[PDB]
Amino acid sequence: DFLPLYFGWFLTKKSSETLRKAGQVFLEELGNHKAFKKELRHFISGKLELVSYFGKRPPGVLHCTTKFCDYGKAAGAEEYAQQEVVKRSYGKAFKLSISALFVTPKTAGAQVVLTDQELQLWPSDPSASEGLPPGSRAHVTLGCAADVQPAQTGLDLLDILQQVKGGSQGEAVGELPRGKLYSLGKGRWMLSLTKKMEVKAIFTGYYG
Ligand SMILES: Nc1ncnc2c1ncn2[C@@H]1O[C@H](CO)[C@@H](O)[C@H]1OP(=O)(O)S
């Protein structure tokens, strides 16, 4: 039997709507914020409406990917699929904790903090991940720029989590209704939610 395109936690319709709108509000507020406007030259090289900037968005249900498999063509795919914990967890319900919303010149996303139980489902094959605890890459993609490729959001999140690793977040340059707004430079932005969002999701496989 051939594997799916990827395994992951697929949010319920309820949660998807909640997270998508939250993400949407973040883009609208961020783009309207003075601290962001005066940094536009570090974001693009040419007022920017971020909702349109991130034109490529998930068509429907949002998800948090664990392992990209490419129907078995991806390295370590077969080995990930064969694990008991994956076959056992298939179809099960989980609660994912969203800790922050972030934006870079390439992607917009939400940071997921996995529990130890959920970390069991994280693959164990990057230089970015160096220093950060496994699963730091976990995320939900909300949108990307026109010519941005898959897997970029995870790479973007890791990079941001490296800046914070060196206590270089800088003071919050503003307050939004949901939390503190941080400017990380090079077009990178992070909203650390005051209260973590919880989303219900089902762990399963997507076959395209
Ligand atoms: N190496 C990869 N190549 C393509 N997609 C990947 C890869 N790693 C993780 N993904 C993810 O698999 C899903 C389908 O592309 C998407 O969720 C990709 O992740 P994102 O960072 O959200 S674009």
**Catalytic status, residue 139:** yes
Using DSSP's 3-state secondary structure scheme, residue 53 falls into helix
Instruction: Among 20, 68, 140, 204, name the best residue to mutate to test ligand 1's pocket (greatest count of ligand atoms within 8 A of Cβ).
Output: 68
Contact in structure between 10 and 207 (CB atoms under 8 Å)? no
| Exp. method | X-ray
CATH of the domain at 40: 3.90.1740.10
Buried b (16+ CB within 10 A) or exposed e, 129-149: beebeebbbbbbbbbbbeebe
Using DSSP's 3-state secondary structure scheme, residue 22 falls into helix
Residues 6+ apart with CB under 8 A from 155: 126, 128
Structure tokens at 15: 């949660």
Q: How far apart are CA 161 and CA 163, in angstroms?
A: 5
Q: How far apart are CA 129 and CA 137, in angstroms?
A: 8
**How many domains, in total, are found in the chain?**
1
Q: What is the resolution of this structure in A?
A: 2.1
Q: Is 126 in the pocket of ligand 1 (CB under 6 A)?
A: no
Q: Can you give the residue range of the structural domain that contains 152? A: 1-208
CA-CA distances (angstroms) from residue 154 to 11, 30, 128, 151, 160?
Answer: 18, 21, 10, 6, 10
